[PDB]
Design an enzyme around this catalytic site. Structure first.
Site, PDB file in Angstrom:
ATOM      1  CG  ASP A 288      -2.028   1.251   1.381  1.00  0.00           C
ATOM      2  OD1 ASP A 288      -3.366   1.377   2.047  1.00  0.00           O
ATOM      3  OD2 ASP A 288      -2.141   2.215   0.395  1.00  0.00           O
TER       4      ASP A 288
ATOM      5  NE  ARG B 255      -4.446  11.854   2.843  1.00  0.00           N
ATOM      6  CZ  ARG B 255      -4.498  12.316   3.258  1.00  0.00           C
ATOM      7  NH1 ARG B 255      -3.846  13.171   4.067  1.00  0.00           N
ATOM      8  NH2 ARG B 255      -6.301  13.104   2.856  1.00  0.00           N
ATOM      9  CG  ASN B 256       0.858   4.281   3.501  1.00  0.00           C
ATOM     10  OD1 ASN B 256      -0.100   4.598   5.437  1.00  0.00           O
ATOM     11  ND2 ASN B 256      -0.017   3.909   2.753  1.00  0.00           N
TER      12      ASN B 256
ATOM     13  CG  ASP C 188       0.524   2.082   8.384  1.00  0.00           C
ATOM     14  OD1 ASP C 188      -0.291   2.430   7.645  1.00  0.00           O
ATOM     15  OD2 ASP C 188       1.148   2.003   9.650  1.00  0.00           O
TER      16      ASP C 188
END
Length: 307
Positions: free
Chosen positions: A166, A170-171, A184
């Site tokens: 992913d 944002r990560n 993450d």
């Protein structure tokens, strides 16, 4: 729901274990799992009188037994993968005398998406700056350098057999020293078929970063991560732009199948855009590896202007 924390046998590791009284809870950082800011006293035994800002991960008041195993899973996973300057590393943990706490590095400047948006020039090349507190505009080199660090971290994670699944802006978090750290990356994969329609609490749709094979056949590999990196690159040069604008989720399936790709963002060199297209290659085996991406970007960073 889950049973009492005492009902379970949390993995106690002497190297990472930290007394709970050594942690000074602070303001919440994220809500999903729950993260809060904290100050650890004596994280480094060599200096027990030093305080360090850290992020503390803990389950919610309403957690399932699987949620506990997932958290542990990430903790043990981080131990496996090891440490790297460009990733959110494990600092410690609290597995006794209370709820499970997983302490990780703290990124004072939040995620990369909001980081960039807050630094959007008043110009026309980008969308309006959402942040009520604008920040200094980043240089051309700063952006490429930002891409380098991310690719750097992924190259490491790739060498550790780690598949993020992913990768997105944002990560990616930014430290006080403007260091890019992937987050993450050690999360547990769900054993239940996904819902391409599900949206994150932030109102984000993971489907827009997923590669065609990962989206249609649910196949995740390092190559599918390279695809996501291509979308992430697009986000960087759009200063926190939204992937496939005005394109419905359902429509995304057909379009991607048609071999359609996003257009080059304004103020983006053709060389950098070609890199995005190579990452978005239809055939996984044809996309470049993180190793190469790190080399090209390094070469580009040295050529890219900082004025």
């Amino acid at each position: 729901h889950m049973a009492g924390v005492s009902e379970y046998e949390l993995p106690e590791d002497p190297r990472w274990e930290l007394p709970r009284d050594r942690l000074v809870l602070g303001k919440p950082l994220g809500e999903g799992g729950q993260v809060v800011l904290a100050e650890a006293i004596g994280l480094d035994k060599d200096k027990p009188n030093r305080v360090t800002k850290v992020a503390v991960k803990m389950l919610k008041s309403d957690a399932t037994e699987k949620d506990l195993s997932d958290l542990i899973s990430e903790m043990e996973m981080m131990k496996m993968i090891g440490k790297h300057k460009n990733i959110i590393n494990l600092l410690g943990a609290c597995t006794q005398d209370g709820p499970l706490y997983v302490i990780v590095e703290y990124a004072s400047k939040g995620n990369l998406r909001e980081y960039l948006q807050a630094r959007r020039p008043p110009g026309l090349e980008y969308s309006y700056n959402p942040s009520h507190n604008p920040e200094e505009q980043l240089s051309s080199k700063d952006l490429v350098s930002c891409a380098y660090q991310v690719a750097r971290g992924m190259e490491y994670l790739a060498s550790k057999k780690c598949i993020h699944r992913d990768l997105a802006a944002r990560n990616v978090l930014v430290t006080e020293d403007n260091v890019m750290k992937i987050a993450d990356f050690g999360l547990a994969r769900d054993i239940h078929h996904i819902d391409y329609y599900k949206k994150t609490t932030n109102g984000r749709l993971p489907v827009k970063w997923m590669a065609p094979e990962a989206l249609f056949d649910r196949i995740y590999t390092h190559q599918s991560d390279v695809w996501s990196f291509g979308v992430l690159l697009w986000e960087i040069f759009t200063l926190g732009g939204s992937p496939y604008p005005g394109v419905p989720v359902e429509e995304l399936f057909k379009l991607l199948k048609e071999g359609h790709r996003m257009d080059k963002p304004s103020n983006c060199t053709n060389e950098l855009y070609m890199m995005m297209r190579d990452c978005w290659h239809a055939v996984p085996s044809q996309r470049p590896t993180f190793k190469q991406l790190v080399e090209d970007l390094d070469r580009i960073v040295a050529l890219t202007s900082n004025q």
